[PDB]
Homo-oligomer: A and B are copies of this chain.
Amino acid sequence: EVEALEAKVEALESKVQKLEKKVEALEHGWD
């Protein structure tokens, strides 16, 4: 379960980073 957790967490970190980049672009009016 722990190694199952590590994978879910790593999957979340990737998605949260993509979301942060998207939201920054929208907040800043980039492009």
Inter-subunit contact B8/A13 (CB<8 Å): yes
List residues of A (1-31) whose CB comes within 8 Å of B's CBs. 1-2, 5-6, 8-9, 12-13, 15-16, 19-20, 22-23, 26-27
B residues near A13, Cβ cutoff 8 Å: 8, 12
B residues near A22, Cβ cutoff 8 Å: 23, 27
Main secondary structure of the interface of A (DSSP, over half): helix
Inter-subunit contact A19/B23 (CB<8 Å): yes
Name the CB-closest residue of B to A3.
B1
A sample of 26 cross-chain residue pairs with beta-carbon separation below 8 angstroms, ordered by A number, consists of A1-B2, A1-B6, A2-B2, A2-B5, A5-B5, A5-B6, A5-B9, A8-B9, A9-B9, A9-B12, A12-B12, A12-B13, A12-B16, A15-B16, A15-B20, A16-B16, A16-B19, A19-B19, A19-B20, A19-B23, A22-B23, A22-B27, A23-B23, A23-B26, A26-B26, A26-B27
